[PDB]
């Protein structure tokens, strides 16, 4: 129903920046833009690009968002195994609340 895309969906580099647009909800309800990737131990997300965002314009909410090859990711279970690499792993980068699931762009690196 909502819409979330990101314009560079492939062949990203680590620093490179990415375009995100999400118009589809309304005003009245806030979502949570992040990017997180499994690790040899269990799971890590980043905390530096954590950042959240809310809808109104009909729901509207494009900004500018970056991505990393390698992010510094940690378990979330006082277990922050290190680093964390979209290499061997997939990067996939989702938007949403518990309430409402906007969706996610599966990030690639050629």
């Given at each position: ?20 647009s999400v118009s589809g909800a309304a ?41 990393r090859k390698s992010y510094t990711g940690?378990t979330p279970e006082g277990t922050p ?30």
């Amino acid at each position: 129903a909502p819409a979330f895309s990101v314009s560079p969906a492939s062949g990203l580099s680590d620093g490179q920046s990415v375009s995100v647009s999400v118009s589809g909800a309304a005003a009245g309800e806030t979502y949570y833009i992040a990017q997180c990737a499994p690790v040899g131990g269990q799971d890590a997300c980043n905390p530096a690009t954590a950042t959240s965002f809310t809808t109104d314009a009909s729901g509207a909410a494009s900004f500018s968002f970056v991505v990393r090859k390698s992010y510094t990711g940690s378990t979330p279970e006082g277990t922050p195994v290190g680093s964390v690499d979209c290499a061997t792993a997939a990067c996939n980068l989702g938007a949403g609340n518990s309430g409402l699931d906007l969706g996610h762009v599966a990030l690639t690196f050629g």
